[model samples]
Target: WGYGKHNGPEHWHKDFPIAKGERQSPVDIDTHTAKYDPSLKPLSVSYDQATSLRILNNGHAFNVEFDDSQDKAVLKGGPLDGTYRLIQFHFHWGSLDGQGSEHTVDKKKYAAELHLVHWNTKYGDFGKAVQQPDGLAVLGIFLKVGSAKPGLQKVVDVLDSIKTKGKSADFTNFDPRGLLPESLDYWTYPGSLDTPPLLECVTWIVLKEPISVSSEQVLKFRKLNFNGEGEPEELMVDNWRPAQPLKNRQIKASF
Candidate 1:
């Protein structure tokens, strides 16, 4: 469940045995150790703004769900065995500007992190895709404190509507391209979902270059509530799980 001392990641293994499984997510990236592989191709993403559906506060983190009925937006190339469809996107941030990112680079944490979740089209649907090892491709973007970025502003601008957990509203015509940085150079590895129901089935394509956002803009997410409406008020912050053990994995790069 929840990201508290008792209910947090440290306690997840009791309920979800997969939590202790190998290839768990949010690992620290040792940039020096990341090998540049010439065989890896550049990542290709084609997102149609109209595919965006609704935005919601899912108690864990707020996310914008997309219409994956058809492959309007998708991820291809890079380490993917085939094309993958974009399903939804979400973020993980802190109570303050110092730290909030789930994955760290050389033990260095960013202000927050962004995950653009995609499902392998080889499977009938996203639900079934989770059953296979190559079911998901998550593009990880580190959010650092700097000048304001217009791309993410569009998502942050709508947070007021879905202030409480389980709340959702219409969000459309949104293109996620600007959310990415100038460089497509990334660190690819095998990993799992960062949250509960933690499946060990994601191809993590983490960009080495981070996109910038203002501290004020980054802190705006802090206002969202973890508790549902009419329930005890709990401010949503520090919702990220700590970095997991990389284990026997090796992080390859496409420079």
Candidate 2:
């Protein structure tokens, strides 16, 4: 389902029953209420620039897929037991500066959100891991409008080639770690993928600090379309799902 009213998140449950499941994603984090976990270790990310395969527009948000055949690029520590392989990283943004971002902090939304999706190697392939409760660990970084970000600028530059759905371009030798904010502090919680087939298998590690991107750079994301070549153009804006209920989850902070 797309972001339009007729098929947006509100209507997701009709197709994927788990859309209304107990542990959904993109929750509004009440910072003051989130407890500090002293035992939580600092998150560790080891990325291999050579692993970048390609960047593509999948009719939704564009993502840079990586070579996950080995543990070349992986996430470890920080409330995680074993290493989780980096498969791809994608972004969610609003049409304008006012809104965007999936998970908001203290009800404050950023201009956009970046998701670095990783899957547990213990469960084998992502296809199998996605179905398990402790399958995935996603790192969410908030993006605000400010000065231009050099690392992110490269990603934005490739948007022109991958404007339509299924369009792709070679996005090699890119370091995913360069996109992380200065601070490693984050809030950890149990959640699901924010899209349809919203499997409740994600361990979300949302960074507290936000990185900066220029107004013009953030707006370039709108160049993508939900429609493919030779079809009517439908700008892929507001593709993010709204914040879900906290329910039984307790968000932990790693200071």
Candidate 3:
């Protein structure tokens, strides 16, 4: 279900009780309350450009799938205990430029947020990994309004090709690591996916630094359609879920 009033975040708990779970994602990251842990190592990211495959408009948001058949693209170090293979990456945004990012920092909302979803190698596949507590790890990058992001242009260019739901294009030779900010400093917490199924298996690593993106670039994301060709014309905007309760969990920082 999409983020419409009929099936939005508030109503999600009716179907998936995990939506109201204590470990739900996109929590408001209060920097002041976050604890600094020197033990957390710098994140290590290794991505093979050839592993990048097609991009899909899966009704909710556009995701760039990767060839996770091997350990070609994997994330290590940081808050993780073992290697995590990259499966796909996606973005969540609003109809407007000022408020779209799933996670807010100190109550500040960014224009958009990029999520690079990875599955722990300890599990056989993403399906199995998602069911485990330490199975999935999602790297979140915030996009702010300023200079035009050349790296994001490559992804935005393909949006027009996969504008409708179920539409996809052969996207190849793209390196997702370029989308990351300079600093690897981040906040780590246990949380669930922001969307359906709402699996409570995500180890969220949210970056402290935000990348710059122009207003024009951010608006292009709203051009996507939530419905396929024959269905009603509904724009795919504001796909992000609202921040959930932090509960007893603590937000650890790697400063």
Relative to the true structure, how large is the alpha-carbon lDDT of every model?
A: 0.90, 0.91, 0.91
Local accuracy of candidate 3 as per-residue lDDT tens digits, 116-222: 99999888899999999999999999999899988889998889999999999999988887798989889999999888899999999999999999888988898
- Mark the regions of model 1 whose C-alpha exceeds 4 Å error after superposition: none
Please give the lDDT score for candidate 2.
0.91
TM-score of 2: 0.98
Q: RMSD per prediction, one decimal?
A: 1.0, 0.9, 1.0
Alpha carbon lDDT of residue 82, candidate 3? 92
Cα TM-score per model: 0.98, 0.98, 0.98
Off by over 4 Å in 2: 48-50
Tens digits of per-residue lDDT, candidate 2, 1-255, equal 889989888998999999888999989999899999999999998885338989999988898999999989989999998989999999898988889999999999989999999999999899999999999999999999999998887888888999999889988888887798898898999999988789999999999999999988987898789999999989989888899999988999997
Candidate 3: stretches off by over 4 Å: 48-50
